[PDB]
Amino acid sequence: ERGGLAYATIKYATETTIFYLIYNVEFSNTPDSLVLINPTYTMTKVFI
Amino acid sequence: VDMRHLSLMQRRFPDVLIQARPSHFWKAVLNDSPEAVKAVMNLSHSHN
C-alpha cells in the first residue's frame, strides 16, 4: 500500500523448476503443439 | 537423535544454513511424526 514502510515486498525464494525438452517427432504433423507466436526469453539457470 | 543431527548440520554450514532456536527444531521434528505422540505431547504442553 502507498506510503507504507516500503514500496514493495519480496519473497526471495519461490517455486523454481528445471526442464528437459525432447519434442516428439510425430507432433511435427501438427505444428501448433510446438510453435510459439513470437520469440521469447528464458531467465532462470541452475547449475548442479 | 534427529535433534542432535539437526544441530550438527546447522553448525556444519553457517553460511548457507540460517540460525535457529531449539524450539523451532523441536516443533519441526514433532510435526513429522505419528500423531498419537503429537496429540499426547500437545495436550501435555498445553497443560504445562
Binding site: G3, L5 | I18, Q19, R21
Partner: protein
C-alpha cells in the same frame, strides 16, 4: 487549583499501562521488535 489537580490526575492516568503480547519478528534465529512497539515515529524521513 482545579486545573492543577486535573493536570496531575492526567499525568497519573497517562502512565499506567501494562504490556501484553507485543508483536515480534524472527531474525537470524533471534527475536526482534516490530517498529510500532517502541515509541519512535520516523515515517517522514525515510523517503528523503
Amino acid at each position: 487549583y482545579s486545573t492543577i489537580i486535573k493536570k496531575v490526575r492526567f499525568i497519573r492516568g497517562k502512565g499506567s499501562f501494562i504490556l501484553h503480547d507485543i508483536p515480534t519478528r524472527d531474525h537470524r534465529g533471534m527475536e526482534v521488535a516490530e517498529p510500532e512497539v517502541l515509541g519512535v515515529e520516523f515515517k517522514n524521513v525515510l523517503p528523503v
